[PDB]
Amino acid sequence: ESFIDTQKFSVMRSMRKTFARYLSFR
Amino acid sequence: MATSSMSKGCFVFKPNSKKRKISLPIEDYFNKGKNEPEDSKLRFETYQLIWQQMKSENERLQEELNKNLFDNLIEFLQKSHSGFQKNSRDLGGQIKLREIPTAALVLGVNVTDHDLTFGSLTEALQNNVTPYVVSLQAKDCPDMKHFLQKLISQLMDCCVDIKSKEEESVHVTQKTHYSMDSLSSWYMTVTQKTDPKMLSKKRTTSSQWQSPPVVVILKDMESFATKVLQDFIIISSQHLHEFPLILIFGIATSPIIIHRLLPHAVSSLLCIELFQSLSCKEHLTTVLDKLLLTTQFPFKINEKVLQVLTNIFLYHDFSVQNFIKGLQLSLLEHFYSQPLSVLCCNLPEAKRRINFLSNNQCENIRRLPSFRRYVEKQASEKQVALLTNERYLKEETQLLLENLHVYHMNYFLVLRCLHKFTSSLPKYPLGRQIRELYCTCLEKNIWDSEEYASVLQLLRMLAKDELMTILEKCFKVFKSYCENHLGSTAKRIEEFLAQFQSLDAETKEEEQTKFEVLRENVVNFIDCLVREYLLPPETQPLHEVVYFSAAHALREHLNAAPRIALHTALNNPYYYLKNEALKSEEGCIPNIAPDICIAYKLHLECSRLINLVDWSEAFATVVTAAEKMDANSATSEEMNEIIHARFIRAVSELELLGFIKPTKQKTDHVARLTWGGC
Amino acid sequence: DRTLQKLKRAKLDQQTLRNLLSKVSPSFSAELKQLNQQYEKLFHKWMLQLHLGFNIVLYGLGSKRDLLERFRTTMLQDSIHVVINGFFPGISVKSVLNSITEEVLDHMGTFRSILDQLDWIVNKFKEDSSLELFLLIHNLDSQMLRGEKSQQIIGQLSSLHNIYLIASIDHLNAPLMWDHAKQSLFNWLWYETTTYSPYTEETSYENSSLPLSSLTHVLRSLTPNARGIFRLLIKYQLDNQDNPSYIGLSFQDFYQQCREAFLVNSDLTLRAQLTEFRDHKLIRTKKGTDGVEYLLIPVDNGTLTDFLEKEEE
Amino acid sequence: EEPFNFQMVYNEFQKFVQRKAHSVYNFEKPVVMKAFEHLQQLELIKPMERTSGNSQREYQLMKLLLDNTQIMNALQKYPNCPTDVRQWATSSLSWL
Amino acid sequence: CRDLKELRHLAVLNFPKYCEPVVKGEASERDTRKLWRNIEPHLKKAMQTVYLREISSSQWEKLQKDDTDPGQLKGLSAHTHVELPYYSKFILIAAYLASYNPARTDKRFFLKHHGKIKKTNHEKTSNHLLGPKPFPLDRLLAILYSIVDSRVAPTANIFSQITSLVTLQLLTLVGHDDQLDGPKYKCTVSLDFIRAIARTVNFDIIKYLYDFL
DNA sequence: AATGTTTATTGGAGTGTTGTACAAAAAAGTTTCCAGTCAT
DNA sequence: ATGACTGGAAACTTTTTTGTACAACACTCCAATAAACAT
């Protein structure tokens, strides 16, 4: 969540949607 | 040749040298070789029978569904038009002549449907109001003089189509000056000589019923010149008392753009009345159920070729012509590929063909993939017997298609009622469209799937306030088609209605009660029919006869790629040439190849403005090494000119396809119209 | 890296180079012949779809005009078929519509505007149901029909099933010449074609350079005093070509240089010597703001560099 | 002295709505183009030299056909002048 | 409004929607201080359409045919909620940025590995205010592949939305008709309805404009 | 005498060479944000 | 010492004139055409 805030907002749909299984634990 | 070495292109070939005049039919070319010549002409004459009857259903279904919209249009043409004659009966009242009535008909992004939506309305106006219909668009004449010239011919063609008192009369337009009185004087004389003196007083009841108005249509007006559209409306405004003009607008987007193309003064006298036309969101319920889910139509396509067809309808244009050409190119190849597909023709017609078959028809049945697997699953005592007999084989082939058609006539009813029964499922996991449910149904086992395991808890949410208005509606449609064919299957549905109506007056004090016991049981009988009359086509035998699953060869006929065709053919010539001596890779470029291959892999690395002088010497680096010539010796000037001569021809062919452009801003600096990086 | 002075392969030929181009490379010629016969197996497949109001689209590689010429000599001997091959700078919409009037319909040309002829030929094929016409149009996307007024004329004839349209596409912008309002009449049926053959016919409109025989035969029939003037301005042009702000020499210094190199004597006689140069597209005058008529030669930069080497004799 | 289109007038339209109590004087959006089109038939604006045919409701680069003298003297003779509007015309826009 | 002819044809249309308490009998004669309360909510959605005779008996009729999902707007600003194809709704969105951005400062939305100068991060410049900038076809062939999720094959029906939208009045041509070697186009409609479509297929265009840093 | 050509004619119907912006990619200018020093 | 002076000081606004780009324009021609002047 800290590395995605250092790039462009347009490429956020390719990293968050792809790695959605890793950003949802507990 | 003899038609390109001159400066003219007028070359015709009329069959006049031959003395005899013969006509070559179309069905005579369906049998190019040994492909049952006696049966090739029999399946072609039925090709037009199943095509001319489905077109009569399309024009009938599109007309019967638009009756609700036509009733809303005829009311405006009989209430506002009737007051026109009443307003002319007095010289003191002028409350309607100050404005021009206009019925706005909004449309969608589809433009090919404008001929069928307005075509059925044209025949409706000839039997209810004025028979004179004027049709025009934007591609006619976008000016001032030639624009009014086309309107003169429209009023003359619609009048000579009635065999009454006028007949043939050749007309030469050679000029007759005209303006605004040419259409006003013609409208006054046409209402006097047609009827034998029948006009009443103050213009009323001209043509028996009401006076025929001058109605025109504007199907293509958004692309027309806006300056011309603001000149012909300001003339009939003050002359409306002697010229009833009716305007019909056909906006293909929204009537909001009308206020931008027309000023406030022009729109002040235009009573715009909006009428929402039936979009393609509700027509898909009927055109996909009364055509591809009926008993009278034995033609049924597979989901592999149907789902890919609905994608183009949703990803691009939204017109009904996509389904017309979709079932057209697939029907001509259905009887040409598999010869056993000719037997798929109703039931009374199919029985008159099985008893008279040729010797080549039995060879495909014994080698049919969907037929050999059924014998191995049943009894093994009939595996080495049907491959030799000839008269006993015909007895079982006509029996399997009858039992298979029983599963088809029952599938047509248990599909639309189950869709309505399962329509009470929110979020739409299987789609709201009637064909979206069939998409996810032909992918795996219905009772054994990952998505099926999640919807088991959603059907149990329905309690009492919702399980009382579902079966009361599905049972009415279930009885409208079931003509007492299978009484053992339609009995369980009828018994459930008597139990729900009995508990309607017994839930006064009832909440595990008696209703909760039947709640968990009705969900099992519905799932029980899934394992009986709801299996995928991959289970029933003889499924490869009428169905067709080959979407790989059906995409290059109606949605091909002209740019990708010349892209993969040059970067990888091994896929088309097929030779081990010239194997292409992903990075290394070949040397023995035509001029259209090396020139395509060289300018790809170039950016925008790249000089061709230093690029021409790099093109010959792979040509000299491809001729297998010893480079240790010296070459002559004649051999080097041949290499440069073909290089110039390659540049002329690259710019012909439209990819590069030699700019004149400098010396031999061709521009590349492609940015690299994606 | 610059103009045309580093490489000795200058002056591209036009007709003296086709003699060495006939020797093609027979690299797997057997595989290229069978590829053409692959499409020949579908001979009796075009008439099964064109009679229903459809068309045939040709795209891919190879010469698209060298393939339809073989299909005409196999089944087009008794059918009314017209082949159109418009590629030279002169093909228009009037050479095709007025050609079926005094040949197909037998009627002299007397139409007025463009819209007067469009609605006149429809009534001849609508009332009669026995007037077939095959249009074997080659390279439909030429270079003088990119306007929208060219497809709306032929689009009206596509609405009738008695008119057959067969065209070829040799451009990646195939749907750029027709939208959804025109595809309902044509009803394009795409069919990929692989021929692999170069083009040796339409190669004429492309820019080569200028023929050197024009600049050589113009000085032989020229007065001796005029040749010294042309050879004097070419020397001052290359010496000042490096200056990017080269606007051309003035008229005052040009008139002084004439008598310094024993040329013209007066001013009115000098203007008469520039009459055969402005008519031969050699030099032209411009409306200068300083009241001085500039003198420039609108040719290529590499052409003047090859003129001093041929005048050594 | 430089041309300007109509979209620049819309930028200050939503600027005068401030410093005012919430009432019913606020408009919407399509009324702005309808109020400006009324001046087209009156020939109060004149293009630089060319009237583009494909120009929409954003590219006009029009100017004015009046002067900075008669516009100020035509305020006291106009019937019914609001108090919150006349003060904005005399001032050179010093508030938001 | 100022003309007398406009109020003559408008006051008649308001009679059927004002004489309701008179026919029912709940309001007697001589009562101009009690009829303005019930008619106040009935005039807030009709006074904003001046100089437009389209407002009649067909505006509220479109809401009757929308029993399922009343999110569609037909009649009052019907251009905001229209039906667009899947691959065609992104054409008007991608072409909007190609007519208001420079032909060089475009690498900030693709290759973020470059070196930005920070010019000022001037604001009242003529950018995004002079009109649509003339752009060819090389820009559209490099921006539609980034907005969509999966890959798209440019077939025949992909380039069909370039010429079909010309008739629909969505993009203008650079005066006369060009040849074929990459023609130039402009824009027509602004971002008045682009934000409504983007909120339906999960899209955000506000974060893509160059003028709004 | 019963027609049909001529007979300029003429308003289109394009026509090509114009002229006035036009949009940069540079050309300028405009200090520059520390540097050095110097002290303490 | 850090905190104080003069001493120099890199991007960065401006113009801008350059080509192009597309605007008209007098435009030659035409195409019947239409009446007239023979029939």
Short mmCIF file of N, CA and C in Angstrom, two decimals, chain D residues 53-89:
data_model
loop_
_atom_site.label_atom_id
_atom_site.label_comp_id
_atom_site.label_asym_id
_atom_site.label_seq_id
_atom_site.Cartn_x
_atom_site.Cartn_y
_atom_site.Cartn_z
N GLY D 53 -17.82 26.76 -40.37
CA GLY D 53 -19.08 26.00 -40.52
C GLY D 53 -19.16 24.90 -39.48
N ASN D 54 -18.01 24.31 -39.13
CA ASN D 54 -18.00 23.23 -38.15
C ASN D 54 -17.81 23.73 -36.73
N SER D 55 -17.93 25.03 -36.49
CA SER D 55 -17.78 25.57 -35.15
C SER D 55 -19.01 25.25 -34.31
N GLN D 56 -18.77 24.87 -33.05
CA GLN D 56 -19.86 24.52 -32.15
C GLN D 56 -20.15 25.67 -31.19
N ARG D 57 -20.52 25.35 -29.96
CA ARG D 57 -20.85 26.35 -28.95
C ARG D 57 -19.67 26.55 -27.99
N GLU D 58 -18.49 26.75 -28.58
CA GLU D 58 -17.28 26.93 -27.79
C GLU D 58 -16.23 27.72 -28.56
N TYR D 59 -16.23 27.59 -29.88
CA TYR D 59 -15.26 28.27 -30.74
C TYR D 59 -15.99 29.34 -31.54
N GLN D 60 -15.84 30.59 -31.12
CA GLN D 60 -16.48 31.72 -31.80
C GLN D 60 -15.54 32.89 -32.01
N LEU D 61 -14.59 33.11 -31.10
CA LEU D 61 -13.64 34.23 -31.12
C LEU D 61 -14.27 35.54 -31.58
N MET D 62 -15.48 35.82 -31.11
CA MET D 62 -16.17 37.04 -31.48
C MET D 62 -15.67 38.22 -30.65
N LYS D 63 -16.12 39.42 -31.02
CA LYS D 63 -15.79 40.63 -30.28
C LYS D 63 -17.05 41.42 -29.96
N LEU D 64 -16.93 42.74 -29.91
CA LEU D 64 -18.05 43.62 -29.62
C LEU D 64 -18.21 44.65 -30.72
N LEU D 65 -19.44 45.15 -30.87
CA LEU D 65 -19.77 46.18 -31.85
C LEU D 65 -20.33 47.43 -31.17
N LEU D 66 -19.85 47.72 -29.96
CA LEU D 66 -20.30 48.91 -29.23
C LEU D 66 -19.10 49.78 -28.87
N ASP D 67 -19.18 50.46 -27.72
CA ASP D 67 -18.10 51.32 -27.26
C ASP D 67 -18.20 51.47 -25.75
N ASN D 68 -17.14 52.02 -25.16
CA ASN D 68 -17.07 52.24 -23.72
C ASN D 68 -17.56 53.62 -23.31
N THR D 69 -18.65 54.11 -23.91
CA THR D 69 -19.19 55.42 -23.57
C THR D 69 -20.71 55.36 -23.46
N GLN D 70 -21.37 54.87 -24.50
CA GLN D 70 -22.83 54.78 -24.48
C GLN D 70 -23.33 53.65 -23.60
N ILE D 71 -22.46 52.71 -23.22
CA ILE D 71 -22.89 51.61 -22.37
C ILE D 71 -23.10 52.08 -20.94
N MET D 72 -22.35 53.10 -20.50
CA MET D 72 -22.50 53.61 -19.15
C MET D 72 -23.62 54.63 -19.04
N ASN D 73 -23.89 55.38 -20.11
CA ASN D 73 -24.96 56.37 -20.09
C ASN D 73 -26.34 55.77 -20.34
N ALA D 74 -26.42 54.48 -20.66
CA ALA D 74 -27.69 53.80 -20.90
C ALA D 74 -28.15 53.00 -19.69
N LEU D 75 -27.64 53.31 -18.50
CA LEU D 75 -28.01 52.61 -17.28
C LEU D 75 -29.06 53.35 -16.46
N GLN D 76 -28.96 54.68 -16.37
CA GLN D 76 -29.92 55.46 -15.61
C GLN D 76 -31.26 55.61 -16.32
N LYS D 77 -31.30 55.39 -17.64
CA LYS D 77 -32.53 55.49 -18.40
C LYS D 77 -33.22 54.14 -18.60
N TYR D 78 -32.59 53.05 -18.19
CA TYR D 78 -33.19 51.73 -18.35
C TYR D 78 -34.26 51.52 -17.27
N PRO D 79 -35.45 51.06 -17.63
CA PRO D 79 -36.50 50.87 -16.63
C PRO D 79 -36.23 49.65 -15.76
N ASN D 80 -36.48 49.81 -14.46
CA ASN D 80 -36.31 48.74 -13.47
C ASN D 80 -34.89 48.21 -13.45
N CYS D 81 -34.01 48.86 -12.69
CA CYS D 81 -32.63 48.43 -12.55
C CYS D 81 -32.41 47.90 -11.14
N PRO D 82 -32.00 46.64 -10.99
CA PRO D 82 -31.75 46.10 -9.64
C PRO D 82 -30.57 46.79 -8.98
N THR D 83 -30.55 46.70 -7.65
CA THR D 83 -29.47 47.32 -6.88
C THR D 83 -28.22 46.45 -6.84
N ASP D 84 -28.39 45.12 -6.86
CA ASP D 84 -27.25 44.21 -6.83
C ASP D 84 -26.64 43.96 -8.20
N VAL D 85 -27.18 44.56 -9.25
CA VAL D 85 -26.68 44.39 -10.60
C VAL D 85 -26.01 45.66 -11.12
N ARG D 86 -26.58 46.83 -10.81
CA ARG D 86 -26.00 48.08 -11.27
C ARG D 86 -24.65 48.35 -10.62
N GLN D 87 -24.47 47.95 -9.36
CA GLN D 87 -23.19 48.16 -8.70
C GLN D 87 -22.09 47.29 -9.30
N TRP D 88 -22.45 46.13 -9.85
CA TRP D 88 -21.45 45.26 -10.47
C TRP D 88 -20.99 45.81 -11.81
N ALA D 89 -21.86 46.54 -12.52
CA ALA D 89 -21.49 47.09 -13.81
C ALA D 89 -20.59 48.31 -13.69
#
